[PDB]
Design a protein around this ligand. Sequence first.
Ligand SMILES: [Zn+2]
Lengths: 377, 374, 693, 361
Amino acid sequence: PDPFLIEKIRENTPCMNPTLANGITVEHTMTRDPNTGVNMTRRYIDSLFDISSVLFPDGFKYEGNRACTPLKHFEEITREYNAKRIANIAPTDMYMIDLMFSYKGEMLYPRPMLLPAFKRGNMVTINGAKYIGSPVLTDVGFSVLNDSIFIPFRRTKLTFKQTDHHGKVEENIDSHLHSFCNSLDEMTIEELKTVGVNVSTIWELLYEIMTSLAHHLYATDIDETSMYGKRLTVLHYLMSEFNYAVSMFGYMFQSRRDREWTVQELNEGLKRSFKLQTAIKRLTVDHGELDTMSNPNSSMLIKGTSILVTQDRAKTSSRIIHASIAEVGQYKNQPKNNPDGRGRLNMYTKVGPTGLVERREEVREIIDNAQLMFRAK
Amino acid sequence: LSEYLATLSMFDIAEVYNHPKVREANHNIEPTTYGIEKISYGKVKEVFNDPTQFIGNSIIEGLRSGTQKTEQLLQAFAWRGFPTDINSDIFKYPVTTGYIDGIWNLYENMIESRSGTKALLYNKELLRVTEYFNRKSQLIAQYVQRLHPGDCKTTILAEYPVTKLTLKAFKGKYYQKEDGKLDWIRGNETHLIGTKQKFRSVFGCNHPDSQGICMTCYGRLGINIPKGTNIGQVAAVSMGDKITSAVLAEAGKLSTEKVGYTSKTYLKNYKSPIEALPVFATMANEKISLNISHCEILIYAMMIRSAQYRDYRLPKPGINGQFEKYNRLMQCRSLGGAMAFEKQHEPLNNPGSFLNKMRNDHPYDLLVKGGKLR
Amino acid sequence: SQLGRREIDLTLLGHTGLDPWYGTTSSARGAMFVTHIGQAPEVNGNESRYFLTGAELEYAKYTHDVRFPEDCRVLHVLRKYPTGIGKDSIRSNPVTTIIYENYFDKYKTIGVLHVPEYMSHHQDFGYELVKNREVWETIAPNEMFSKDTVIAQSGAVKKDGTLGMGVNANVVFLSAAGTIEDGFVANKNFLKRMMPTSYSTAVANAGRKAFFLNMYGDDKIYKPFPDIGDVIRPDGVIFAIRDHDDDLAPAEMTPRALRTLDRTFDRAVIGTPGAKVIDIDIWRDERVNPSPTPTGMDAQLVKYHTHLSSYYRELLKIYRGLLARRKDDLHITEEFERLIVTAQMFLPQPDNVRKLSRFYRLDPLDEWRVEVTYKAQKMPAGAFKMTDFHGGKGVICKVMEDEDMPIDENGNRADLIIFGGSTMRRSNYGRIYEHGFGAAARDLAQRLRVEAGLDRHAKPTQQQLNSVMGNTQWVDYAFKELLGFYEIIAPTMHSKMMEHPNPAEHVKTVLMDGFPYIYAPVDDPVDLMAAVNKLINSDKYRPHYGKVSYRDQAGKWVTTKDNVLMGPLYMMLLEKIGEDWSAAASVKTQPSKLNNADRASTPGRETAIRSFGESETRSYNCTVGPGPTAEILDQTNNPLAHAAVIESWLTAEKPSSVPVAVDREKIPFGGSRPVAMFDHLLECSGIALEYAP
Amino acid sequence: VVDHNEVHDQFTGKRIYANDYNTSNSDEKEEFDRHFYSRLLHRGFERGLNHFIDNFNEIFQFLLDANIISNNKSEFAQFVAQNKDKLFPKYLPVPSKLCFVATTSGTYLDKPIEAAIDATLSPIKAQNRTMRGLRLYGQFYEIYAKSRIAQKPGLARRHMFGARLNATARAVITSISDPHDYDELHIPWGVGCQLLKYHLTNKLKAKFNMTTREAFSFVYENVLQYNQIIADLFKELIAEAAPYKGMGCTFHRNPTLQRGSTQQFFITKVKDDINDNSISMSVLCLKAPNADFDGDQLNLTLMPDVYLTKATERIAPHTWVLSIDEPHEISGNLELQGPVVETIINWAHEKYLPPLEEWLK
Ligand SMILES: [Zn+2]
């Protein structure tokens, strides 16, 4: 065609978001800072291990992480177990890190761990097969279901209908109350409760549920269909098998006993808690955010990085039309799994830091004009 | 006929769009259901039916010939009216434009996009439960078979009341009129709309076959059936295709209601089946177009003589009319047919199945024993 | 009403904004249009759409390609399989591996980048990577490259910023007999331009269990597989495998039997007959002290294995030199470390360390693992699905010649015949404005071509295009005519190009290709039927609404009666073409005829198809008599009847129309395997299923 | 009810009646297990296992006590007194090796296999162990008739009612828009080259001087390659059917509810284009099953005999013409398609002649 016509089309065209068209998994995973070379997965591990530092005994200390050499990786993969070195020849993106704990100096044996090594365009090969890792739309704060209210925690997954987790019964209610008051003070969850629930301890959270969140059971203000104000986590569901091992390792020093340890029990517990495939064994069998790549094309904007999953699709009414669907999602795009058009990624949305979905300004008048025309009956 | 090929272009759209009676029905129209479905749609439905207006246009000539539907043309050349949500909730303000002049407002197009959302709720449980319903109906309907042409010559004529709604179900049926021998209805009688007419049904005629019927008892539907064809399965098939087409208001509730009536104990056990046929007829024919010759077979398949002596066999006179449950019919009769239904091991450890009683014969009996002649 | 005004931006439509007239089509068909995108392969002939919106410029900037992630400098440039002169002079280098050092950083991290010959994500569908000729010449061991300098672009990305997702075809709307149940009557010359590419990979092993065979050569050479850049045989057998025996050496280990292929007692690999070999990868265990393969068969294997071992040895030597130079300060990317441990897995272990046991997803290899990757071009004949970027999709049911296609009175030849009556049923009217307005466009572009001295339906040369431009008044009148046509069609594009510098170049770029590319975004102040009535009720800008001549099913030149308009439409090919077919006269049995493994040793599938379910045998018991419907199951569940039907097929003078195959006097009823198994399992319980009067 | 003493004296095989009676697992698990193993009153008389067992009478029952506390059945005593011989003989049979399937890195076994406890074995303890083994026999046979027979994947509903037939094919469908007959099928080259292999072998051993190995190589070589000899042999094999139009075959639909889902056609033409892999069907037969061109794969079986082709005449394209709902009405499957009707609409319903007033004036 005419080059001036394509120039005028390029001059009058809204540009897509470069962070979402290239993949937000590229941004929120393996993005090195200019100060030092540390990926965002290693930063998430470093921010997860210091939370459970108050559950550690005196002298025990987690001391960063270091990148492993491939000469160490080849010996750690092909480890002789039964006089046979089983090398798995398969194209798989992985990289190996360490843990490097210490107990009053004299640091112990390092525990290597594998990491999935994502690539550009939300694409990763595992065990020969290609896969796509999509982010999950997660609301900031608490979730309001049709019956009860749900809060996310690092170790408990309880709902709220008179139910909690679980002569000689006097020590069970004491061992529960021991861990109930200090282990539920995770700092990242205190930064997650910035929606107005400003608590310090869980005993104030149970009070503020009863005096402020008590009307969220029958006359809640949550619209239950709006996609505004979300976190868009991709790393919270990817490391779900590693956080479980972190919580089970933190249960050793607090829930079981609080006595003096030695290096022979600490090395045994470190070998029994952190194996080689902690975050790798349940990646392609239970994680609903990882899908099989079946795109016979060259563009990644069609089915590569334009897939979103809800909070119910990650586990492997609410389908009311909302005016926020046309802003952050893609309406008139109805697959078989999500026929309402809720799981879709529109590139023309405003996303700031840490995946926080913020609203725009140029389309706000049309959305406010169309929203009040919906819910009037 | 190769020179006369129908075509479609922009000119065929502009020929029907530029009519003044169509353009008058799209301007000065209040957004009301009466103002759209009765006022706006009527002024274009009265000009689509005019045979002296559009001569040569392929769309109108295909509409009058039964190819194109008029329900899909009122949503394009006239005002589209009130698309719905996932649930059956209508909206207050409808869409102004149609499909020729497209929808270009965000609110109206977002309502219109929810009209195609209900066309994807195609979960596998529905296709599983309709196949389970077909397997439950046909396995018990397959007992009666091998109708014979002729006349069994019985005077045990039953009597049924005929109404307006079930008159199509009595199309091919022989009845007894005054000063006459036999006559078939064929469905053109405005009279006999409230009386109780004496018919000739399968309940109570005498044929020498233990599981067969005659042509005059079944009606005029038997000559449309081929000679080597099971009359037992085709009743459940003729029910099930209309049920699946109703599946594809709350047709699953209708399917479970027909399951509870036919293959359960939800019906009150009447003394005679002549009062069980019109209730099932007025329950079925009000929503599913089904002939009563199939309903007679579906009722006769649950009939057992001498229930106090465990003689699980079909009686040839239908005047007895003793009905029991569906599972007792599946287990205590024709074990070769019992191996085809669920819970195969329960007829095995039963003391009633180890004694030689005279019983019926399922067609599956040859597949169980491998294909032996005796 | 306000039919002209509209407020919908491109920011609110995710994938719906790729085509205009989105409000005219239905919601379900508009969703099926987005569903059809993402199932489309890349054909060889790609071109831009005639009605370009503002969306295709944004989808062309985010594709799968080989780009530099950061400002860096190239350190080393390696390549597998070096091409020179001699006996080891294999051509068509598939991949090149380059290593860079990340410039402008506090820690100089080292990275790696592979440039392959192709890229494929689907199992049997992929596209080639054409290389940028400017960047590929500047590939040096001392060269600084900036961020996002693309290498090896795809075929859909053109020189300017566009995206080719389909082919423009002259679609005629006729009620032909071939257009039954969404049927397409495609031209033979149009299907040559819609030709997808399939990249496949076949892998085999040959060790102590079995060894190779001698194809692709005479009795003075041994070649178990074709070389890189060779053609596969007319039969699809590639690296057929024969079992390992000792006492059958003068019978099977002879140069006559190594050349011929036995279809039974062997394991071959069937692929595509006409296809070029692209890549070859050979793994080898070289630590066993007995060599299982005989001599004279391991030349072409080691010819690739030595080059691959030298490549991986240099790849490990570079990392070892970088580790010896920069001690305790090396930073590496997450792709390079996997490449180094892969190079360590390929290279053999020393004698002081135990040897490796290589596995491929719980499948061990035995001393050889050869995988080839080949490329074929698939020509569509039947059961190919197509879509005009709307809800209306179809399947090609009849392929006519180029001379038997519908042609109008202006010489335009049709490429597709689609039934028009399905438009009013499914309510997809966006195909009406695309077929119509383009018919008002090309007939304009063929008018301004024929108004001067030129020839229509033919690309003009430079000597004529440089001689037409001498008349400035004629090109000014043509520019005014094009501006009037744009004012009729698209007022935003017309107001854009009202201030156009050097307007003779617009006339040149219109008369070069024979179509004016019309820009039509999603926010247009256009009354569509008013523009239709302006195009119809006018002397100029009117399409040729005349008669159309064609050829019917018989041999006759047929001219239609009604005036038929032919217009352009942008078509594409879809997924699920006809290749998953099966045919089996005999299937292997269980030690009861079910097989589920890597079944690629026969052309097409050889598995038994469960055509007789429970409902199928119920309908065959009711409609067909219960007698003859048990013989169909007894000819399968009994192996003696399965041998007897082949004996009756092979002993009769007529293979078809045989009266009796399995007589019930020698092989009677009662020899079924699951029936006897159930009878035995019930006999050990203590009861029996019989009857007596 | 089968006499267990009648089956163990008329065996005349290996006559190894002592399986557990002689072996004692003294270095015999490597030999007796892999080479050999790799009327039960407890089935019927099992209404007494709620929280107490009425079968605590261990040994020497001498069943003559009519103490029956049961409300479900009253003819159980008549069933006992009809054939009193029930679990009386000493020779109980052992299930065969085909019922238990045993490889790879890990030995995989199935959970209903719990009958190997009887192969591994004072009188008051041995007599209790015999009834322990008899209760294990009943617990094995009940769970094997419940989990391997009563389930929908099982011996009864999957293998006893037919599965995976031979001489079959499965492919997508197209239409024939031609002057043809209502029962004509067009098999492609790749399907017809493998469905008719022994027919081509017979024709190549009859018309040419070839062995069966060279004939098999000529058949398997020309599957993805067109040649004139295989096409001429296909035309000869079509022309060999003297009273029929070709080879009789059956054609199915995967949802099979109505009569039209299972039809019988005749193979009449093998296609020459190797790229076309689809079976082309008649236009008028498209309506009786719900079959469209939406990428669906449909099944086909080949009738070998003349008697089988005559017996398959009960399912024909002419059998579903008459409706099964109305007594005198042809069903709607005879109705023509859209573009077939529209040409007759444009031809007949046209302003062709002046009206009757102008015609006679
Ligand atoms: Zn009768």
